[PDB]
PDB file of C-alpha atoms in Angstrom:
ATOM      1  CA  UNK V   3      27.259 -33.099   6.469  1.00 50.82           C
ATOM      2  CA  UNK V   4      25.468 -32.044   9.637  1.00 52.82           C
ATOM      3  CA  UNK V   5      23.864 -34.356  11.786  1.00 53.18           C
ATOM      4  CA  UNK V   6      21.269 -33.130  14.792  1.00 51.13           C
ATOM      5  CA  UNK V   7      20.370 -34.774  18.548  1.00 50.76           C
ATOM      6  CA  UNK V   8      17.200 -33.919  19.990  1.00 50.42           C
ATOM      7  CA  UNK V   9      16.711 -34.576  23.818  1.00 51.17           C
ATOM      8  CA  UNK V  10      13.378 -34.575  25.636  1.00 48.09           C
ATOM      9  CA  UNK V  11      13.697 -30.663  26.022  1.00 48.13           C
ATOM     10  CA  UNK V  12      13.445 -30.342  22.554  1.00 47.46           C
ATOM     11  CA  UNK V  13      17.014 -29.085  22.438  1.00 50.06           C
ATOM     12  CA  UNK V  14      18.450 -29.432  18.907  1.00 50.95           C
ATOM     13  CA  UNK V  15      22.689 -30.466  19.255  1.00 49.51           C
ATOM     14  CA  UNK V  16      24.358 -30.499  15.938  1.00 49.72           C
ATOM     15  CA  UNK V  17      27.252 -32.019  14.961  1.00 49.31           C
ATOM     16  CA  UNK V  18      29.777 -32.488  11.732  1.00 47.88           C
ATOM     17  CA  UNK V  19      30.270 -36.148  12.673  1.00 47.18           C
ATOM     18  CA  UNK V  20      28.279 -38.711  12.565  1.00 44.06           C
ATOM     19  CA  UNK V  21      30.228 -41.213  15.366  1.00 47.62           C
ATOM     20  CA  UNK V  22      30.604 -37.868  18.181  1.00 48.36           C
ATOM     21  CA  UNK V  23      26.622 -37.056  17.391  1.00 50.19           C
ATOM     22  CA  UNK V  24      25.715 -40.562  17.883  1.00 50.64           C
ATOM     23  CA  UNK V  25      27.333 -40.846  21.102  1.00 53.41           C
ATOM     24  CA  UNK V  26      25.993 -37.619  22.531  1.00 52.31           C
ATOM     25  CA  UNK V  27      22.217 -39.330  21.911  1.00 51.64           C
ATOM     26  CA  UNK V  28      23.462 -42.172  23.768  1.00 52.17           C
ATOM     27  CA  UNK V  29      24.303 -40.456  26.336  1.00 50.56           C
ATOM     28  CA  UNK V  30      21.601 -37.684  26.700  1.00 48.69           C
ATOM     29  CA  UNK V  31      19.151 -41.036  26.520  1.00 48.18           C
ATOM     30  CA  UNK V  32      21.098 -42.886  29.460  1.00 50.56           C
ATOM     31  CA  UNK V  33      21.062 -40.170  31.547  1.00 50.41           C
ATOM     32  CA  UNK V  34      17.804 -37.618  31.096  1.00 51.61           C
ATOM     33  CA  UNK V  35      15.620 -40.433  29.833  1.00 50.65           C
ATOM     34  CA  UNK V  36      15.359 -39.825  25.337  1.00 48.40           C
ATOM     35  CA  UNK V  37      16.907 -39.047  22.411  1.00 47.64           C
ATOM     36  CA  UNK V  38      16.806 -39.044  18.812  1.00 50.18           C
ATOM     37  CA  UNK V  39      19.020 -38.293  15.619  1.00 49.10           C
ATOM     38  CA  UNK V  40      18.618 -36.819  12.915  1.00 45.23           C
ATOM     39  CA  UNK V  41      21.056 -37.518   9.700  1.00 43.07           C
ATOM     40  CA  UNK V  42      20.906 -36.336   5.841  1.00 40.60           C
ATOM     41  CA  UNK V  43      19.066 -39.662   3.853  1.00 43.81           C
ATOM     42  CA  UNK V  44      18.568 -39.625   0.368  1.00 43.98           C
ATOM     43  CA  UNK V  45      15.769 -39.267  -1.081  1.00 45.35           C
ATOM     44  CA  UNK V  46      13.322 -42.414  -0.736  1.00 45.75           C
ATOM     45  CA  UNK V  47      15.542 -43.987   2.106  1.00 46.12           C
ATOM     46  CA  UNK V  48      15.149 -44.322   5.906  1.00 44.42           C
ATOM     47  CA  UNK V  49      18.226 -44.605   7.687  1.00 46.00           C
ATOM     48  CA  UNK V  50      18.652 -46.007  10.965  1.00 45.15           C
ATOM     49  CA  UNK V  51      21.836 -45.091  13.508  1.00 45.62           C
ATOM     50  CA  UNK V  52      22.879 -47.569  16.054  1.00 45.95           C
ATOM     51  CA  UNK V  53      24.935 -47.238  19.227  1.00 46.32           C
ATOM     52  CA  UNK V  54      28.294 -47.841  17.789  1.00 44.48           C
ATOM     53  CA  UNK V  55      27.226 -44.495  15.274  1.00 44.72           C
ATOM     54  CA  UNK V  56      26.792 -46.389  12.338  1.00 45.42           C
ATOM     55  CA  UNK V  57      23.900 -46.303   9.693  1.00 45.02           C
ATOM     56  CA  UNK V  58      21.348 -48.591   7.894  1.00 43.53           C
ATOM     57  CA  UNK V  59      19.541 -47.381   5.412  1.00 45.05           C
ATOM     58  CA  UNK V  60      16.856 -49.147   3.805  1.00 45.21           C
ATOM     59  CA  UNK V  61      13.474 -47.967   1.120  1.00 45.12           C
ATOM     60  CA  UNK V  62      11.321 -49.551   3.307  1.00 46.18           C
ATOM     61  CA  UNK V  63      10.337 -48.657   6.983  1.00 46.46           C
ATOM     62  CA  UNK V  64       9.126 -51.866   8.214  1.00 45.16           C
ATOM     63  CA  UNK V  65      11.899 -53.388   7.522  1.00 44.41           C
ATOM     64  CA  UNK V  66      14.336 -50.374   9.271  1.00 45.21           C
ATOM     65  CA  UNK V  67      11.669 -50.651  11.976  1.00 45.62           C
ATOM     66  CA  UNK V  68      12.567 -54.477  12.529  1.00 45.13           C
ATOM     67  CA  UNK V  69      15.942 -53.441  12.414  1.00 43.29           C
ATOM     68  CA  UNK V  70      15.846 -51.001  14.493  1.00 44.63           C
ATOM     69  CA  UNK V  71      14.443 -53.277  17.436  1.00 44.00           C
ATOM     70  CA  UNK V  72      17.145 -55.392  16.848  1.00 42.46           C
ATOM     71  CA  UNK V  73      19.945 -52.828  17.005  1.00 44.80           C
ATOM     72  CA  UNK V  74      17.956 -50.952  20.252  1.00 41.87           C
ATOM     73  CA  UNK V  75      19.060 -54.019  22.388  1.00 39.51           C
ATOM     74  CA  UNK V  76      22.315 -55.156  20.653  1.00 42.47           C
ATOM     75  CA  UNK V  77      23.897 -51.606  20.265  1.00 42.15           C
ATOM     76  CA  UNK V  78      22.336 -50.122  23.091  1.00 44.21           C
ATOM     77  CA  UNK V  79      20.890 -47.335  21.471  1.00 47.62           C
ATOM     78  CA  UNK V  80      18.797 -46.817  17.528  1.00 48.56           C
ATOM     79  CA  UNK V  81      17.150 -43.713  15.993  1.00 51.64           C
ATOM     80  CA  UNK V  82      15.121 -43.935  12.779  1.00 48.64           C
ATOM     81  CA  UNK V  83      15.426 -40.851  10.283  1.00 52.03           C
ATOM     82  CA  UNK V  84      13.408 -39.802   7.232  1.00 52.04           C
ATOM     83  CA  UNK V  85      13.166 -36.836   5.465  1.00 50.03           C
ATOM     84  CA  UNK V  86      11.505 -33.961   6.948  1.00 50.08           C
ATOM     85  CA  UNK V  87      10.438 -30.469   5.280  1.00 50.24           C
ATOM     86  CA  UNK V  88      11.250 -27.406   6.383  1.00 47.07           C
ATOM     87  CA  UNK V  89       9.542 -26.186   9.701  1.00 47.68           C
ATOM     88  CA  UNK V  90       8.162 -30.023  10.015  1.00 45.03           C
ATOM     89  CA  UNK V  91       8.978 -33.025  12.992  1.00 47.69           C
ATOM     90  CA  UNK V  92       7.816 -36.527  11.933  1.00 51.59           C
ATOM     91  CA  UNK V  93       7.132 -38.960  14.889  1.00 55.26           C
ATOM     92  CA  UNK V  94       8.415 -42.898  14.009  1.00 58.09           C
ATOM     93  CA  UNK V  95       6.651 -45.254  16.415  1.00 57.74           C
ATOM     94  CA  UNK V  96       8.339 -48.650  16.987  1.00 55.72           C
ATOM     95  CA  UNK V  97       5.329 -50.152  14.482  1.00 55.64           C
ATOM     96  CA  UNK V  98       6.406 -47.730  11.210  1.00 54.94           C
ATOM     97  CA  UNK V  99       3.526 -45.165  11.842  1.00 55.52           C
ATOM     98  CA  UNK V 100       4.755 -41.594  11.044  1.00 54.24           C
ATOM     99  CA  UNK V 101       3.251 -38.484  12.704  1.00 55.47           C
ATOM    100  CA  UNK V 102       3.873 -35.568  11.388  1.00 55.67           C
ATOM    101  CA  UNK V 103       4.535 -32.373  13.569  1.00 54.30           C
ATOM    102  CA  UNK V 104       5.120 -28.177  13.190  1.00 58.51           C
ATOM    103  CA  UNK V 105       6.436 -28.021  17.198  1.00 63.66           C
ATOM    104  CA  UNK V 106       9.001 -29.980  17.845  1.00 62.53           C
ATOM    105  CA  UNK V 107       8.380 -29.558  21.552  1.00 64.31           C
ATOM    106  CA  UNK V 108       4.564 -31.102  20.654  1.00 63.07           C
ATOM    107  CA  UNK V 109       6.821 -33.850  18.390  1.00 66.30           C
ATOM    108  CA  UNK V 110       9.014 -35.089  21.338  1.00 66.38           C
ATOM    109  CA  UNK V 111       6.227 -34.768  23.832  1.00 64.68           C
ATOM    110  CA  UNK V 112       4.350 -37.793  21.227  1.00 60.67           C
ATOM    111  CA  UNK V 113       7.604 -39.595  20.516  1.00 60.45           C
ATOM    112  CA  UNK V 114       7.249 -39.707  24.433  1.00 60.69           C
ATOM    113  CA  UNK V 115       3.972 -41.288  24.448  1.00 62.15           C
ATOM    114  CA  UNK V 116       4.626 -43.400  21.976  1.00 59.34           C
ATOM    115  CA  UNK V 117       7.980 -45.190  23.543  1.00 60.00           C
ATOM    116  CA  UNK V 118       5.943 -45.755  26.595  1.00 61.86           C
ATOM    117  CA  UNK V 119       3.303 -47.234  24.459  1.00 64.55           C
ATOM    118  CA  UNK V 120       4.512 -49.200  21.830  1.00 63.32           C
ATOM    119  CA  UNK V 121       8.559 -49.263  23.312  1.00 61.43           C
ATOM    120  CA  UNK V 122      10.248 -47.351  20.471  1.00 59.16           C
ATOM    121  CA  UNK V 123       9.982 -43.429  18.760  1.00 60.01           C
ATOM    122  CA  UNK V 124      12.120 -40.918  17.195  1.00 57.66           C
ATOM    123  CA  UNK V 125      11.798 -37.512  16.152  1.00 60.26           C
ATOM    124  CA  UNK V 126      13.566 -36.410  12.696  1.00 60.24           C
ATOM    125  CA  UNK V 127      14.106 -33.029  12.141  1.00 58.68           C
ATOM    126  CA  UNK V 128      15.042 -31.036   9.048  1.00 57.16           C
ATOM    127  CA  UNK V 129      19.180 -31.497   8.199  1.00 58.28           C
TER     128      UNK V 129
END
């Protein structure tokens, strides 16, 4: 599998496990401010990764959006993923809204926006 970290540079860090790519987001969020990750999910699931590197995937984003806000404070860290197409970013705000992207510079700057806003975004990029 590969699994991708995006920081608030838009700088894409890719990994072949998920537990080392989780921690790097942790990190890169503690100390530069954000951070997202990006994992394969099949088709019709969301997945979210906490800060111990595990997943929860779910068919329906409110509920991975509760869960998320759950796992944000308990784990320390939580990312929500979807599927993405090719040369597309899709925005997750912390109330389920997607917004979809085709710069992931002009994605992260919104997932920015958005955290400050409504306290929780991720970017997903294509696996």
């Amino acid at each position: 599998s590969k699994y991708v970290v995006i920081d608030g540079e838009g700088n894409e860090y890719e990994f072949t496990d998920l537990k080392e790519a989780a921690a790097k987001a942790k990190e890169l969020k503690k100390k530069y401010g954000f951070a997202s990750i990006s994992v394969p999910v099949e088709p019709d699931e969301v997945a979210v990764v906490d800060g111990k590197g595990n997943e929860h995937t779910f068919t329906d984003i409110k509920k991975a959006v509760e869960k998320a806000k759950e796992l944000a404070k308990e784990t320390g860290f939580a990312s929500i993923s979807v599927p993405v197409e090719p040369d597309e970013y899709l925005v997750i705000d912390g109330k389920g809204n997607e917004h979809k992207f085709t710069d992931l510079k002009e994605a992260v700057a919104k997932a920015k926006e958005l955290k400050k806003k409504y306290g929780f975004a991720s970017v997903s990029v294509p696996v």
